[PDB]
From a paper:
We focused our attention on human RAD51, an ATP-dependent recombinase crucial for homologous recombination (HR) and for error-free repair of DNA double-strand breaks. We therefore explored the possibility of using a more stable orthologue as a surrogate and focused our efforts on archeal RadA from Pyrococcus furiosus, a protein that was already structurally characterised and is closely related to human RAD51. Here, we describe the complete process of generating robust, RAD51-like surrogate systems from this archeal protein via two distinct approaches: by stepwise mutation of the surface of the RadA to humanise the BRC4 binding area (HumRadA series of mutants) and by generating an archeal/human chimera (ChimRAD51) in which all of the BRC4 binding part of RAD51 is stabilised by parts of RadA.
Initial analysis suggested that at least four residues surrounding the Phe pocket needed to be mutated: I169M158, Y201A190, and V202Y191, K221M210 (we will use RadA residue numbers to match with the residue numbering in our crystal structures, but indicate equivalent RAD51 residue numbers as a subscript). Mutation of these residues in the monomerised form of RadA was used to create the first humanised RadA protein (HumRadA1). This minimally humanised RadA mutant could be expressed and purified similar to the original monomerised protein; its crystal structure confirms the success of the mutagenesis and shows that the binding site resembles that of HsRAD51, with the side chain of R204194 moving to the position found in RAD51. A 16-aa peptide (RadA-OP) corresponding to the oligomerisation interaction epitope, as seen in the RadA heptameric crystal structure, was used as a probe for RadA-like interactions at the oligomerisation groove. We have also determined the crystal structure of HumRadA1 in complex with RadA-OP, which shows that the isolated oligomerisation peptide binds to the ATPase domain in a very similar way to what is observed in the heptameric ring structure of PfRadA. The FxxA epitope straddles the central β-sheet, and the C-terminal end of the peptide folds into a short α-helix interacting with the oligomerisation groove. All the peptide residues that interact with the domain are in identical positions to those found in the oligomeric RadA. In particular, DSF showed that the introduction of the K198D187 mutation reduced the ΔTm by over 1 °C. In line with the expectations, the ITC experiments demonstrated that the affinity for the RadA-OP, being relatively robust for HumRadA1 (KD = 1.8 ± 0.5 μM), was weakened by an order of magnitude with the most advanced versions of the surrogate system (HumRadA33, KD = 14 ± 2 μM).
Author numbering:
A (entry chain C): 94 to 108
B (entry chain A): 108 to 285, 303 to 349
Amino acid sequence: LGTFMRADEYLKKRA
Amino acid sequence: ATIGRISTGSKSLDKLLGGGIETQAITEVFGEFGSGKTQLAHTLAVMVQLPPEEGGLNGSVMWIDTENTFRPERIREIAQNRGLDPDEVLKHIAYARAFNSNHQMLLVQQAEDMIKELLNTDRPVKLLIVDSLTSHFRSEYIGRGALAERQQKLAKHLADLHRLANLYDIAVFVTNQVHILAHSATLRVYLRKGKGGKRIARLIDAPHLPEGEAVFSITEKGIED
């Protein structure tokens, strides 16, 4: 979150 | 190097743009809340991944938010409705949220590392989105004499973005919420609401524009005519 992440992993993180 | 052009999803808007948004350029879209800016950013993040006969560049995406704007499910929807695998499209978008304007500047440096990594693969970065590009600069540099420093810092950030666009053959796409302040994008596009739920686009200060306005809708495919 302080740096880039792949959007599929981001979706999972936010869930 | 040849300029690439990414379709917006709207033939009307693509025509206004001379075929699509250009690599080796910064395109700025600006307008009021609800004018379509974020929807255009989400659509481009899908379109750039298409092959060129579908308006894309077989490209990867990097996305810097300043506010909480990016919606992975909206990407999935747009992709699914255009005949793509929604989850595969997500694997080709790298996302970061800028905490403040200084972090935003660092993120651009980090973006260069991924751009270099992917450059000679079959899915090089072809689109770098910065949403609400000025929002932190406007909140942090405020008050008497802040104009000079704010605009100087912005100019540097924009120079860094121009360098990435030109050095790595990327389209840089930035959005801003509503002169007299300086602007440094290659191309500025004003968006507004029209009748019947449409959005209207106009090029600002682009005399090599064949004159006109584009009209488009926001749908389950993102942006289309």
